[PDB]
Design an enzyme around this catalytic site. Sequence first.
Site, mmCIF file in Angstrom:
data_model
loop_
_atom_site.group_PDB
_atom_site.id
_atom_site.type_symbol
_atom_site.label_atom_id
_atom_site.label_comp_id
_atom_site.label_asym_id
_atom_site.label_seq_id
_atom_site.Cartn_x
_atom_site.Cartn_y
_atom_site.Cartn_z
ATOM 1 N N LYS A 178 -26.733 -29.628 17.401
ATOM 2 C CA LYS A 178 -26.795 -28.312 18.479
ATOM 3 C C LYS A 178 -28.142 -27.717 18.461
ATOM 4 O O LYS A 178 -28.873 -27.517 19.708
ATOM 5 C CB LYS A 178 -25.546 -27.438 18.183
ATOM 6 N N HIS A 206 -18.608 -35.430 24.602
ATOM 7 C CA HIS A 206 -19.477 -35.096 23.732
ATOM 8 C C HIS A 206 -18.725 -34.569 22.580
ATOM 9 O O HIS A 206 -18.035 -33.212 22.744
ATOM 10 C CB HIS A 206 -20.182 -33.856 24.598
ATOM 11 N N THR A 207 -18.918 -35.073 21.352
ATOM 12 C CA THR A 207 -18.020 -34.826 20.076
ATOM 13 C C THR A 207 -18.194 -33.698 19.482
ATOM 14 O O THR A 207 -17.361 -33.210 18.647
ATOM 15 C CB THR A 207 -18.191 -36.106 19.707
ATOM 16 N N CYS A 208 -19.490 -33.189 19.388
ATOM 17 C CA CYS A 208 -19.873 -31.737 19.033
ATOM 18 C C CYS A 208 -19.051 -30.777 19.654
ATOM 19 O O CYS A 208 -18.924 -29.483 18.986
ATOM 20 C CB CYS A 208 -21.292 -31.821 19.473
ATOM 21 N N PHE A 209 -18.590 -30.826 20.739
ATOM 22 C CA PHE A 209 -17.778 -29.746 21.608
ATOM 23 C C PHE A 209 -16.319 -30.259 21.655
ATOM 24 O O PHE A 209 -15.826 -29.451 22.396
ATOM 25 C CB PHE A 209 -18.468 -29.487 22.961
#
Lengths: 373, 373
Positions: free
Chosen positions: B169, B350-353
């Site tokens: 991020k 989007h695996t971060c979110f």
Amino acid sequence: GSETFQDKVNFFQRELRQVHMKRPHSKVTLKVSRHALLESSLKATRNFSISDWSKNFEVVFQDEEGGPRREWFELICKALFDTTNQLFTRFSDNNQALVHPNPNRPAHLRLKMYEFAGRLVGKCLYESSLGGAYKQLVRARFTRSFLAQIIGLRMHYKYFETDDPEFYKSKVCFILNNDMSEMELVFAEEKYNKSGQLDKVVELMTGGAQTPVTNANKIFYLNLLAQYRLASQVKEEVEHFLKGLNELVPENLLAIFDENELELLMCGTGDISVSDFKAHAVVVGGSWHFREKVMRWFWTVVSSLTQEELARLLQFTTGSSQLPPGGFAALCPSFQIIAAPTHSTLPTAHTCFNQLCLPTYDSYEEVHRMLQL
Amino acid sequence: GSETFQDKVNFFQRELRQVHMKRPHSKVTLKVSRHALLESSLKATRNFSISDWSKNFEVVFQDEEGGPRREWFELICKALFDTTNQLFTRFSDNNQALVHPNPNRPAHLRLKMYEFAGRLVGKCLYESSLGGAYKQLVRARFTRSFLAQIIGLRMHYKYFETDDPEFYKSKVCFILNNDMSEMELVFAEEKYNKSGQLDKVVELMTGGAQTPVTNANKIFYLNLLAQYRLASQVKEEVEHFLKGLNELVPENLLAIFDENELELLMCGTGDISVSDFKAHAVVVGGSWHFREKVMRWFWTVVSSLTQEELARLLQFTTGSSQLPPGGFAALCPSFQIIAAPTHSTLPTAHTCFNQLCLPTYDSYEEVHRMLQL
């Protein structure tokens, strides 16, 4: 070698007094009903002239006889812009989102109401211009696209970030962030009915359906789309809104403003509480240098900012100079400071996520210079 | 014309039984102490051979005399991988993040403990291979970078998305999403002490400090950075971890897997509850066609998926095949489905979110084909 916000305000307020030098410094009465405030406020002023709108308002409510003037302005603004009556409306069903003239209004709201809105916003700007005694700030969190239509600007897709997050996050970002060479999109929009059946495709230009979105015309697409969604569907409502605005405030005066300044001129620098800010803010990433040295320089610079710069900051990172109903704890996504890997670059933001991208600065004095947006 | 996950598992489990054909189908005892499980489990097995690790475990606790075997495996896995003892650790201070060998371990944890971890992960894979009777799944949510080190792969910056969100991020995204031509970054990393003073700069390669990050070598930078942060600081701990793993499971066997398959082989397809999914999932953007026709095709296809595909889906969108402690309501960012403007394109994430980018599909059967990742 150019002009500060404060200079523009003084020029605007001076020019505006001179426009009304010949308009009278005398009294006019309104009688209104809290029960049905908008409807009674319209009828109270139905017989008035432009000249009358310049005169000081003596407001009387039924069921209690300056104190009511402030109360009227407070309530009338809510009545128009608070979106309860769906005269104005938000695109995102979030109750903190910004407001816009209703694209598809209930028939039971005539266009006279938008004209009245414009007269009221006009009057707030005008009384605000006479001195601290008469000051009335507009209590409303407008879309940037709407503020920009007031000034007379072309729509740009940047306005989606603030006005329809859902739509920026979902479609605009996708298009900006992908190869259009393996997607087969076009310069049309497909409208579907309540239920979900393709009733009609709408070309954004002639042969739009025939024209594919390339990576080279990606941006022309997005702004043609900005025109369509933010402005095209509300031409009539805005035309009437500024018929009203332009009775007290000639349009050429407002040209010296961009959208975020016009918000500050209409609604003031508000009252934003560094203590509430500190409490519900969030920090993400960065070295011990960032986490420990930069973030304390930040909060120091913050407590040393004019009410005016604190609003310029809140606006630069969230989209509006104004906090929602519930203060910082109501921000959709919490006000967040992300560390950038840079030193000595201009601080950036993502207003869709209320994110401030604060480079890792080397001095206190560099933080101070950079938080003076 | 290639190989399904299930085929790989059968090949791996068969090859593995044949590696231990000559190892004995007889008994060996452990006596352990719940009070200090890791320490007592090490001492229980300190005298054992590789051959002994193949034999069926008869576990006895102090203070109660298959039922304890399962209990031991459950607790030993937690003891190692649950990060309480900081043997393994997370980069993000979120208690749902994935786990990694400790870069900077307390001295009081020797390297023998990592070897033991590898023997234990080895044993779970091995018993899992003999049949439903003996099956032991590894109870751990590993970083992709760690799973990839097990297999023997180069580190790539994609691994940051799952392993150190904060860092993806904040820094990685910035670099990927900006012009490096007006930033003056370089191929070094600046380390600072507890307090926040620049103790040492570390070149990622010779003259790294002298080499500026261009837009052309941006990616070489990010992966040199992936090597440094995810692998370089843990060479020793991983070397010992797979000394242990490779005693029961030869490394060449595990080559046929990528990181997400190796997670499914180690930890199983778990039990993921469409009812919990439906309840705490979130939808963003899209037409009435999307909101009404596509999203109901989605939830239909979902309730018609093998436990195995449901995990493949959860992994593709969140980063792990496994839910955190608190089920779907614990996902850092709520599991979300964003509408893409495309029809008939491959679904993205989007695996971060924890975001699944689901195109607006035209048929039920197209949703079905596409949710078979």
